[PDB]
């Protein structure tokens, strides 16, 4: 996972921008929209590649308004999480319910019940931790999580993860 996908946005440009710095404005409008965005379909569109070689093609002029529509062909780095993907990450939050791990652009939440039964919460620590006879999971620790499922919300993807199984947990 973390992919390089060929994608293409359609952008309508107003006649005031029909100057020589046109292709410039188009490429910036592309990055304004596309970069930093997040769809369920392709995932997180993190960074657009080969800025110098983005394909503008010809722009068809839209009938009653002046503006012209271009289909900007481009290629970018994407992050799509999946069920069963084993991910390495950092603990960001910690409660009676569990802990959230940051994996690149997204967060994966680990349920109290999706951890070994030996691991138990301790609110009486600064900051709150999950204590075991061996390890202590807290607000800065590195964890290997197995994604159990995803949910696509607005402009992000969140997932639930387990550390119950073998070879998973604190690293």
């Amino acid at each position: 996972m973390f992919f390089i996908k060929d994608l293409s946005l359609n952008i309508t440009l107003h006649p005031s921008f029909f100057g020589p710095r046109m292709k410039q404005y188009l490429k910036t409008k592309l990055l304004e929209e596309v970069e930093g965005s997040c769809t369920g379909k392709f995932g997180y569109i993190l960074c657009v590649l080969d800025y110098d070689n983005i394909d503008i093609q010809r722009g068809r002029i839209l009938p009653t308004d002046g503006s012209a529509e271009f289909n900007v062909k481009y290629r970018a780095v994407v992050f799509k999480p999946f069920k069963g993907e084993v991910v390495d990450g950092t603990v960001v939050s910690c409660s009676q319910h569990g802990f959230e791990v940051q994996v690149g652009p997204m967060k994966v939440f680990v349920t109290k019940h999706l951890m070994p039964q030996d691991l138990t919460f301790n609110a009486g620590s600064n900051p709150p931790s999950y204590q075991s006879s061996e390890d202590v999971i807290t607000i800065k620790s590195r964890i290997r999580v197995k994604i159990e499922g995803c949910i696509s919300q607005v402009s992000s993807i969140h997932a639930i993860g387990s550390i119950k199984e073998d070879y998973l947990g604190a690293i």
């Binding site: 992919f3 390089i4 060929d6 293409s8 929209e33 930093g36 379909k41 110098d52």
Partner: protein, 180 residues
């Protein structure tokens, strides 16, 4: 919803049912993440999955070259790696893109292989395996000691590779690992 991005995959989605299936490590990723992809030239091209180390370098490269283009139009190591990257982002990105800043810090902090030289050698090694781009990316991103660790965390590998061949590869990777 919004004026979102299209793809090079052409759908025949006419009235017909939301027949959609699961996404796993049965290597059933989307139709969007099928092995047999089609580039902007129309040619069939194989899926590009990136191990953290690669992805780190791709983004860096892209961003550096972008800064160069922005300087043309203007006319007419470990912790320092993070320090520096956050300065390149200041210059090439919109700042509002919190996703990329978050990714860069993650990639910078979780990459196994620093320099391009080593990443090329990792690519060369896993190249020959004949495994799926996803399994190849996971082998580069996840640090495993035993073939059991690998085959457990990457279930799809199951009968695809010998236990010792996988264990041979795993040694080459731990040897190729940068000393931060």
């Amino acid at each position: 919803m919004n004026v979102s991005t299209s793809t090079f995959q052409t759908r025949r989605r006419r009235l017909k049912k939301v027949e959609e299936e699961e996404n796993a490590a049965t290597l059933q990723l989307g139709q969007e993440f099928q092995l047999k992809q089609i580039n902007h030239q129309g040619e069939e091209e194989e899926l590009i999955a990136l191990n953290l180390s690669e992805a780190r370098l791709v983004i860096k490269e892209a961003l550096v070259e972008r800064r160069r283009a922005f300087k043309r139009s203007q006319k007419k190591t470990r912790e320092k790696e993070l320090e520096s990257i956050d300065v390149l982002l200041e210059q090439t990105t919109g700042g509002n893109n919190k996703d990329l800043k978050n990714t860069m810090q993650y990639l910078t902090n979780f990459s196994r292989f620093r320099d391009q030289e080593t990443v090329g050698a990792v690519i060369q090694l896993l190249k020959s395996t004949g495994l799926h781009p996803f399994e190849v990316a996971q082998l580069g991103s996840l640090a495993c000691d035993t073939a059991d660790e690998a085959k457990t965390l990457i279930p799809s590998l199951n009968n695809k590779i010998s236990d010792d061949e996988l264990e041979r590869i795993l040694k080459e990777l731990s040897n190729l690992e940068t000393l931060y």
